[PDB]
């Protein structure tokens, strides 16, 4: 008499949970990224994983997917002008 | 099979001037595919072919070089082309003249793995048990002093050198093939 | 495409060996004995026991001591090569 | 074949002592990994026959540290088989702002550094302490290299002349385009809540999420680590991830009142759920042990396959680092107790 | 047909510029470089096609073995001991564990004779006998297996001071010319070699009798400096030294394999997204840095994903050590199918037939 | 023996139930290695 | 669309072997012998 | 398997002449091939350990004409494994 | 392409083998032994 085990394998990749409506991939910049509620205010983020034990210190390591840009412009012999960008969360200084 | 046996290739034009032109190489007054001992750094690939030779092939065979180098596409690069059949190798083998107890040894002289293998033919084994003496070890704790040799292994292709200005393949009708500054007179061939 | 395996539907192709369908028999490359040796690396062995010379005068190889007060009167000794049985190796592996 | 390849690489605390030789007591030298001995009937001719399992105590051993390592093999092949090598490398340039700037004419300063620590700049297939063992390297010399499109003046001034307005700048972005977090999960734990305090989310995009051993990531930021005793892969660097199966499931919360999903559109409203234990609703997929709202947002996320029935995606569209390629589900039977 | 005019120049001017650097600084750990970048006048370059160079001096380390088993008596078995002598209390004697395969002609005083001078005048009838450095070597033997059992009969062995090893993994570097393995004394100088010889003869059937106990076989000994450099012992019998009749049994087994080089696509040897040192690019007019850097932006993956994205992966470039690292698919999930042996298979004996009869 | 040739007494055997067949060495494995199991499959829709 | 056809006899000779070791009684020790007799002197 | 697909074809100078065997004096016949003798301690198996390198003296030959040529084989298992053959050829026009 | 094969021109390309021109000699693994037993099972015997 015998009982049944299953399991799976998935290594080399990342987990992935887009920030869409419905989860398809229309776009750079998705729909939801624009809406208002999100964009003219501010709100308090929890999350909360639950994975198996493990008899060694481990790491949980999460990516904030954003949008992060430099542009270039140089208008004088010898001269470099740069700006850099990350949108949701800092870019450079103020005042 | 036989492509990695050239060292150096020089072209002239009416016994005063040299096809590369003005200077337009590490190497100005002609091409040089391979090379000994060199100081310089003018290797690449862990082999010893010099760049000039790597650019002006990449540049022959896929329009690559003035923007970084990378994998060229399976499509553009056929069986009979130059970098599917581009091989590295390196060793490292004893030196002699700092170890000090180098001992040449004839192939008569040397036992190893003796007492179960032949001898000088694929005859019955032979012989007692003792400790061997023929391959130097190169590893662990009493390894010997060593030296290093490369070279590059290349088949099943032919070298190209292209009669352009900069070396790109921009059409059929090469420009420098038009020019009556090199298509409107005579001129005399020497190579070496 | 057919060749890769989805495991929803149990979409997997079933296809034969194309070595087997078709048997490209090429013989199996034999040059060499490979032969089977004795645990202990000498089979066969004998009994001896050790002698040395004397003061050899002239023509006294004929008398000889015999060493017993150094070395053991029963030291093993082997003559000859080695006991080995002998196999040939791909063949049977072609075989089966 | 079977004792070599997998019975040498057994967790540690199956073996035991060897008898009347010497052993390091450093658990983290070539000398104690190798002295030790393991017995050759746990992984016999016998074992799970018929069964395309995977052995249970090796399923968190990091894989990629292994002498089969086709990729390893060749690079130490390539650089020699000695053990005093001079070498030549070349190296490139990474940081996503100059990969790709189009210089102009002028005099520039560039100025980099370099490292000299033994076991960030080499690798085993072992895994080792190599500050104790004794690898060394010295650099010698150093020189830069660059390469000009011989093209004719008039174009170059031309160009150069139009590559200087104020509209025609340039731009770039990092391929990647992540924020990294990076947080400690506590032996034998099993719940990690993260907070994130009021701010805005603008232009967000989603989030990417996987698990790491605390003993092959390196201190951020930090010149030198003395405290960091280890030469295998490191995933957070070349990107060889092991452990994505030992997660359980994901919960998400806004304002702490409302969850992210909301309205009704998975299974398990409140939560994601990417595997399950025995559990008799009829829920898992791809006769495996994950569900079906994972299946569904995995399939979406990667290929925009699950609103019209599921196939094989094309093999242009699935690289060597996508989540169908290496996805393999398996399944076996025991003796009940 | 190609353009044929502004595209290409005629001043002369450098197709690939070499910048040697202006300032080096040293450190325990770090190691920062500085050069001075030079864009001439009418030109463009685009920084995609730039790149280091460095070269040096590399010490892999005393763990390095890329080679999987030994290359040292590979086919001698696991647990055969080599031809040796060792002491023992009975007030002590020395007991013998040797082999000799080679035939020679007539034993004498001097030693086992091997060949003869030619047959000539002043010439003929001159005995040559075996040089004690090299010439009785462990490789000759007999020819076929219709051995006649020869009354001359010579070999080697190692005398008691070196210590016993098995014969699987043992190797000792040649010190003569000719590959004959001894250990060259200092005495008067180090010209000279310490070969011994010893000599043995039937027991039993030359017990009784005396017959001059005529000898019958030679063993010419030495001493090698012997040393296992990549094999260890997987059974010792008892803990100590000085090599004992149980010391006779003791078996080796190979070292695991390690493949010490340098890391995929060359990670960690740049300085990336981090403040403590980060890499300067500026215009030398006014030092207004064009590289900000923060602590989060991880580069090294994003070059890998990008690498994957804009092409194909599993072809190997040398110029970049650029070479995907990958498992065996059959490693990490077995696919145990048992084998295939439905025939036998027989190892039968070299003359054909084993035990025979008289008739 | 040198020929590349298939045996004339093989040709009209059916060479799709062999025990290297792939696809059905990877469904037998897939299903489990025992003798009773417990199935949780999903049909599709085959009509045109 | 054109192509030459072309028939007959082709003699490869004595020194063409397809299949490499041996075909006659292979799994044989390289040294046995047939049961044999042979004369010899007193 | 190294002493086979190797050894066999080092270069004629490294191989010596046998014993008691009649051998052809013309360098090309198959026989002045075969029946040459080379002693496998050249390419025994403790050869350029964990070195990924060709040969030194097996560089400059030919490696085309050698027996795991799989077009070559399969061109010469296509007419037959006989000797003395019928054969139906096609062949096509070339010039431009 | 030119790796597939065609009979009628007889177009089949030559190559060479990729592991005999360049040798990656690992070495091999043994790290178990390898015993030829006896028919009977028992070698040798006495008599009780
Ligand atoms: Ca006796």
Same mark, same amino acid.
């Given at each position: ?95 | ?11 002239? !034009? ?39 030779? !790597?650019?002006?092939?990449?540049? *022959? ?20 082309? !130059?970098?599917?059949? !581009? ?33 000088? *033919? ?71 | 495409?057919? @060749? ?23 013989? @199996? ?68 | ?16 002592? +060897? ?20 017995? %050759? ?50 190296? %490139? ?11 102009? %004419? ?77 947080? +400690?999960? +506590? ?9 994130? %305090? ?140 | ?51 280091? &160079? ?20 590979? =086919? ?9 002598? $060792? ?14 395969? =080679? ?41 076929? $297996? ?101 010391? =006779? ?70 110029? $970049?050590?650029?070479?995907? &690292?990958?498992?065996?698919? &059959? ?9 295939? &042996? ?18």
């Amino acid at each position: 008499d015998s009982i049944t085990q299953k399991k799976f394998l998935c290594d080399r990749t990342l987990w992935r949970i887009p920030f869409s409506s419905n989860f398809m991939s229309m776009g750079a910049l998705t729909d939801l990224g624009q809406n208002l509620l999100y964009a003219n205010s501010a709100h308090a983020l929890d999350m909360t994983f639950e994975v198996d034990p493990m008899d060694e210190p481990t790491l949980l390591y999460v990516l904030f997917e954003v949008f992060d840009v430099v542009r270039v412009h140089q208008p004088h012999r010898g001269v470099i002008e740069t700006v850099y960008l990350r949108t949701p969360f800092s870019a450079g200084n103020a005042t | 099979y036989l492509n990695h046996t050239f060292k150096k290739v020089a072209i002239t !034009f009416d016994s005063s001037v040299s096809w590369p032109g003005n200077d337009r190489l590490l190497t100005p007054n002609e091409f040089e595919i391979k090379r000994s001992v060199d100081g310089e750094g003018y290797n690449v690939a862990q082999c010893n072919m010099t760049k000039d030779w !790597f650019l002006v092939q990449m540049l *022959a065979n896929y329009n690559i070089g003035y923007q970084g180098f990378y994998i060229p596409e399976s499509y553009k690069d056929r069986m009979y082309s !130059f970098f599917r059949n !581009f091989q590295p190798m390196s060793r490292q083998v004893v030196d002699d003249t700092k170890y000090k107890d180098y001992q040449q040894v004839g192939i008569i002289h040397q036992h190893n793995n003796s007492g179960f293998v032949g001898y000088l *033919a694929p005859t019955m084994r032979e012989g007692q048990a003792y400790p061997a003496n023929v391959p130097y070890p190169l590893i662990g704790k009493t390894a010997v002093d060593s030296i290093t040799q490369k070279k590059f292994l290349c088949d099943r292709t032919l070298w190209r050198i292209p009669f352009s200005s900069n070396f790109m393949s921009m059409g059929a009708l090469t420009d420098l093939g038009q020019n009556l500054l090199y298509a409107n007179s005579a001129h005399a061939l020497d190579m070496t | 495409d057919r @060749t890769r395996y989805f495991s929803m539907w149990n979409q997997a192709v079933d296809s034969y060996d194309p070595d087997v369908r078709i048997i490209e028999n090429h013989g @199996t490359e034999d040059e060499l004995p490979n032969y089977c040796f004795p645990l202990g690396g000498i089979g066969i062995t004998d009994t001896f026991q050790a002698v040395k010379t004397t003061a050899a005068n002239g023509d006294q190889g004929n008398t000889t001591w015999q060493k017993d007060s150094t070395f053991a009167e029963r030291n093993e000794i082997g003559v000859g090569n080695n006991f080995a049985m002998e196999i040939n190796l791909n063949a049977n592996l072609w075989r089966n | 074949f079977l004792y070599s390849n997998i019975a040498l690489y057994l967790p540690d605390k199956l073996k035991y002592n +060897p008898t009347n030789v010497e052993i390091s007591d450093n658990p983290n030298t070539y000398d104690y990994m190798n002295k030790r001995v393991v017995a %050759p009937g746990l992984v016999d001719c016998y074992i799970n026959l018929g069964a395309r399992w995977s052995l249970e105590y090796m399923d968190n051993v990091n894989p990629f540290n292994h002498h089969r390592n086709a990729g390893l093999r060749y690079r130490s092949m390539l650089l020699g088989n000695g053990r005093y090598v001079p070498f030549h490398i070349q190296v %490139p340039q990474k940081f996503f702002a100059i990969k790709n700037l189009l210089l102009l %004419p002028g005099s520039y300063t560039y100025e980099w550094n370099f490292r000299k620590d033994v076991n960030m700049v080499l690798q085993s297939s072992l895994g080792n302490d190599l500050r104790v063992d004794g690898a060394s390297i010295k650099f010698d010399s150093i020189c830069l290299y660059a390469t000009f499109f011989p093209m004719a003046h008039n174009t170059a001034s031309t160009l150069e002349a139009m590559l200087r307005n104020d509209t025609n700048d340039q731009s770039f972005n990092d391929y990647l385009s992540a924020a990294n977090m990076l947080y +400690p999960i +506590p032996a034998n734990a099993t719940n990690v809540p993260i907070s994130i %305090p009021s701010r805005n989310w603008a232009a967000f995009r989603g989030w990417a999420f996987t698990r790491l051993k605390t003993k092959e990531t390196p201190s951020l930021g930090s010149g030198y680590d003395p405290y960091y005793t280890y030469s295998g892969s490191i995933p957070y660097l070349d990107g060889t991830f092991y452990l994505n199966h030992t997660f359980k499931k994901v919960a998400i919360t806004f304002d702490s009142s409302v969850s992210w999903p909301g309205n009704d559109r998975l299974l398990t409203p409140n939560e994601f759920e990417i595997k399950r234990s025995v559990d008799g609703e009829g829920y898992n997929v791809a006769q495996c042990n994950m569900t079906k709202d994972w299946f569904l947002v995995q399939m979406l996320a990667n290929y925009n396959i699950g609103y019209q029935g599921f196939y094989i995606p094309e093999s242009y569209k699935d690289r060597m680092y996508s989540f169908f390629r290496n996805f393999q589900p398996m399944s076996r039977q025991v003796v009940d107790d | 047909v190609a353009p044929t005019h502004d595209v290409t120049t005629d001043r002369s001017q450098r197709l690939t510029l070499r910048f040697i650097p202006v300032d080096r600084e040293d450190t325990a750990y770090s190691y920062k470089a500085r050069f001075t970048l030079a864009v001439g006048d009418n030109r463009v370059l685009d920084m995609a096609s730039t790149y280091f &160079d460095i070269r040096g001096v590399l010490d892999r380390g005393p763990t390095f073995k890329p080679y999987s088993g030994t290359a040292y008596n590979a =086919l001698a078995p696991k647990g055969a001991p080599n031809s040796c002598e $060792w002491e023992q209390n009975e007030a002590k004697k020395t007991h013998v564990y040797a082999q000799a395969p =080679l035939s020679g002609i007539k034993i004498t005083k001097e030693g086992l004779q091997i060949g003869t001078a030619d047959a000539t005048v002043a010439g003929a009838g001159k005995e040559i006998f075996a040089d004690k450095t090299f010439q009785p070597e462990p490789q000759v033997g007999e020819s076929q $297996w219709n051995e006649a059992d020869a009354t001359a009969a010579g070999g080697r062995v190692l005398k008691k001071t070196t210590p016993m090893k098995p014969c699987y993994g043992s190797y000792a570097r040649p010190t003569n010319s000719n590959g004959g393995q001894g250990v060259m004394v200092e005495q008067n100088g180090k010209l000279e070699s310490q070969v011994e010889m010893q000599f043995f003869s039937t027991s039993t059937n030359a017990t009784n009798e005396v017959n001059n106990i005529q000898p019958t076989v030679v063993l010419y000994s030495e001493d090698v400096n012997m040393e296992t450099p990549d094999t260890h012992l997987s059974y010792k019998p008892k803990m100590g030294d000085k090599n004992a009749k149980v010391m =006779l049994g003791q078996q080796a087994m190979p070292n695991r394999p390690n493949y010490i080089a340098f890391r995929d696509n060359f990670i960690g040897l740049m300085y990336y997204n981090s403040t403590g040192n980060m890499g300067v690019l500026a215009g030398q007019a006014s030092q207004l840095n064009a590289v900000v850097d923060l602590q989060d932006r991880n580069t090294e993956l994003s070059y890998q994903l990008l690498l994957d994205s804009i092409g194909d992966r599993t072809r190997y470039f040398s110029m $970049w050590n650029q070479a995907v &690292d990958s498992y065996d698919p &059959d490693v990490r999930i077995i696919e145990n199918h048992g084998t295939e &042996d439905e025939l036998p298979n027989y190892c039968f004996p070299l003359g054909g037939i084993g035990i025979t009869d008289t008739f």
